[PDB]
Amino acid sequence: MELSFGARAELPRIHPVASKLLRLMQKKETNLCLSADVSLARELLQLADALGPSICMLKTHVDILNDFTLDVMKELITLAKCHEFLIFEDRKFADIGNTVKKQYEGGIFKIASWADLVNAHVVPGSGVVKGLQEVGLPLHRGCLLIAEMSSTGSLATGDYTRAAVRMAEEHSEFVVGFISGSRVSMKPEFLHLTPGVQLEAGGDNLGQQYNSPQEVIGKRGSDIIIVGRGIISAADRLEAAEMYRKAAWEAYLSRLG
Amino acid sequence: MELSFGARAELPRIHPVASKLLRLMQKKETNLCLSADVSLARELLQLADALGPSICMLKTHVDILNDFTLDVMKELITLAKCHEFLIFEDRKFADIGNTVKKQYEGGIFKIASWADLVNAHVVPGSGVVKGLQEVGLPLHRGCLLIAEMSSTGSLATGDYTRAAVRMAEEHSEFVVGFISGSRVSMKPEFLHLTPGVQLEAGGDNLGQQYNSPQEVIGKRGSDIIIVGRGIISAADRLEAAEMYRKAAWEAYLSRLG
Numbered sequence: 001m002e003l004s005f006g007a008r009a010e011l012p013r014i015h016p017v018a019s020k021l022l023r024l025m026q027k028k029e030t031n032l033c034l035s036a037d038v039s040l041a042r043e044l045l046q047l048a049d050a051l052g053p054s055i056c057m058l059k060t061h062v063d064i065l066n067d068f069t070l071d072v073m074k075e076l077i078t079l080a081k082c083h084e085f086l087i088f089e090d091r092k093f094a095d096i097g098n099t100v101k102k103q104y105e106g107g108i109f110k111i112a113s114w115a116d117l118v119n120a121h122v123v124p125g126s127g128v129v130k131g132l133q134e135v136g137l138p139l140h141r142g143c144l145l146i147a148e149m150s151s152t153g154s155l156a157t158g159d160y161t162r163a164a165v166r167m168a169e170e171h172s173e174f175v176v177g178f179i180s181g182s183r184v185s186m187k188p189e190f191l192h193l194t195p196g197v198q199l200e201a202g203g204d205n206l207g208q209q210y211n212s213p214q215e216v217i218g219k220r221g222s223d224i225i226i227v228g229r230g231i232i233s234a235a236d237r238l239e240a241a242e243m244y245r246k247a248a249w250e251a252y253l254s255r256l257g
Numbered sequence: 258m259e260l261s262f263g264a265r266a267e268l269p270r271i272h273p274v275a276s277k278l279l280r281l282m283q284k285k286e287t288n289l290c291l292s293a294d295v296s297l298a299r300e301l302l303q304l305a306d307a308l309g310p311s312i313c314m315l316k317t318h319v320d321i322l323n324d325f326t327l328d329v330m331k332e333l334i335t336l337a338k339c340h341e342f343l344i345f346e347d348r349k350f351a352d353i354g355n356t357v358k359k360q361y362e363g364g365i366f367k368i369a370s371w372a373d374l375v376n377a378h379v380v381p382g383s384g385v386v387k388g389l390q391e392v393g394l395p396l397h398r399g400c401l402l403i404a405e406m407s408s409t410g411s412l413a414t415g416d417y418t419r420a421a422v423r424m425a426e427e428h429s430e431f432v433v434g435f436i437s438g439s440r441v442s443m444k445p446e447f448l449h450l451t452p453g454v455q456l457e458a459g460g461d462n463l464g465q466q467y468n469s470p471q472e473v474i475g476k477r478g479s480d481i482i483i484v485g486r487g488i489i490s491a492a493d494r495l496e497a498a499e500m501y502r503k504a505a506w507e508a509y510l511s512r513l514g
């Protein structure tokens with residue numbers, strides 16, 4: 001009954017950003033999102049260029065780049081177009097709608113001008129989505145809602161997660177999916193992206209907890225693994241990305257049957 | 258039984274940032290925080306200079322400033338020192354500890370270098386605090402935890418709010434208080450700052466809901482009102498700030514008896 005990524009890309013209610021993502025995931029045999037958690041633009045762009053072919057998405061934290069400029073994002077877009085991946089700015093909007101509108105469009109970062117995807121916490125209520133949508137819908141962007149978190153003590157559980165899902169299913173013109181640790185929506189037009197991923201067991205010293213690609217894609221039913229340190233701390237980041245890609249892709253294939 | 262701000266500033270377990278804030282609130286007879294939600298540095302600095310004497314705190318969203326530079330924050334610090342108010346960067350950190358550490362210290366904004374106070378959502382678990390504290394404690398900064406929000410559909414209620422309070426009471430070396438709509442902690446060393454404040458009833462079109470200074474300081478027991486549009490959209494921002502200051506200050510005095 002599970003549809004392939006390529007088939008999900010054609011669903012009637014699919015958002016165009018999700019459809020583009022699903023089509024390139026199927027074409028490239030990748031459901032890996034690189035979390036490019038680096039402070040130097042040159043390293044961001046060298047990673048994007050070398051690992052571009054292995055990834056479906058590159059997740060940025062632009063407010064940790066020491067040398068951010070809009071020109072850096074222009075170069076990143078050139079690579080995303082060349083290698084075919086989407087740019088996800090992991091900004092975690094989490095304010096009232098009137099504020100996030102300006103945070104998304106304006107300031108130094110002009111996030112909406114270069115990010116295909118952004119994410120938002122649902123704790124403020126649906127005004128967070130409505131505010132972002134006022135900017136993002138005209139710019140043909142999409143939003144991910146944070147339905148679960150991977151860190152110890154996360155409060156994004158139970159009824160909070162269910163509120164996130166309902167908020168997404170009510171704003172499907174702009175919300176394309178979730179950050180979660182598992183499948184949280186039964187609707188196949190919604191993407192599920194899962195961080196806290198490493199091939200080995202463990203965590204970090206600040207509350208991160210890791211699960212494997214096979215677990216999060218296979219058993220828990222998510223679509224895309226978001227990997228940072230498991231790739232970016234490795235000596236050979238390209239081979240590491242390929243290891244994560246093959247893991248997440250096989251897990252997806254085995255789930256479909 | 259309620260202690261004055263000046264007395265709370267001397268409590269044994271008071272954090273130095275809170276003590277400094279409480280002492281200047283008492284000296285200046287102001288418990289008003291200006292939410293300086295503007296896009297131009299010149300307007301930010303003209304507001305800070307003119308309204309400085311009327312406020313205990315200026316809350317920034319630096320990621321909406323079109324013309325942010327570190328020099329703008331240097332000029333803002335000069336005014337905060339001159340007029341005696343604290344600078345609160347309303348960044349709403351809301352990520353895993355390892356990420357927020359870098360978001361706080363680094364990037365273009367170097368928030369920890371100029372903000373006396375920042376705030377954090379508790380949804381990631383206590384790693385968000387631990388990560389920020391790794392930067393902020395050495396820099397003698399403080400953090401506010403978001404225990405409630407003013408916007409329609411807020412999920413920061415019930416057990417979520419109680420988790421925020423517990424997280425604050427367990428990280429009192431760095432957490433100085435809360436963003437909330439009411440008193441949520443019975444411990445007087447913790448500040449309570451309340452946004453969603455206007456003299457008239459109403460809201461905005463993106464989910465903001467307003468309550469009056471008398472209600473939030475008087476009946477609901479909060480310490481400081483955070484006001485944006487009720488001041489910044491008025492023609493005479495100084496007279497508006499004075500109106501809000503007198504409202505919040507009288508409400509506090511009447512509560513003490």
Ligand SMILES: O=c1[nH]c(=O)n([C@@H]2O[C@H](COP(=O)(O)O)[C@@H](O)[C@H]2O)c(=O)[nH]1
Nearest residue numbers: 035149150195196227228229352353356
């Ligand atoms: O629940 C969540 N957990 C999580 O780690 N992230 C983010 O995803 C990345 C994980 O990085 P690594 O731990 O793999 O090195 C970091 O950039 C976090 O900010 C996230 O967005 N949501």
Ligand SMILES: O=c1[nH]c(=O)n([C@@H]2O[C@H](COP(=O)(O)O)[C@@H](O)[C@H]2O)c(=O)[nH]1
Nearest residue numbers: 095096099292406407452453484485486
């Ligand atoms: O619950 C919350 N509600 C809230 O409005 N704020 C913030 O406080 C300010 C309110 O602005 P006004 O509605 O008064 O013009 C804006 O800068 C919001 O981002 C906040 O931080 N928390």
Ligand code: PRO
Nearest residue numbers: 004006007008010026
């Ligand atoms: O991607 C493709 O080519 C096919 C078309 C139908 C679904 N998948």
Ligand code: PRO
Nearest residue numbers: 261263264265267283
């Ligand atoms: O601020 C003051 O001067 C007094 C001293 C004790 C408490 N308040």
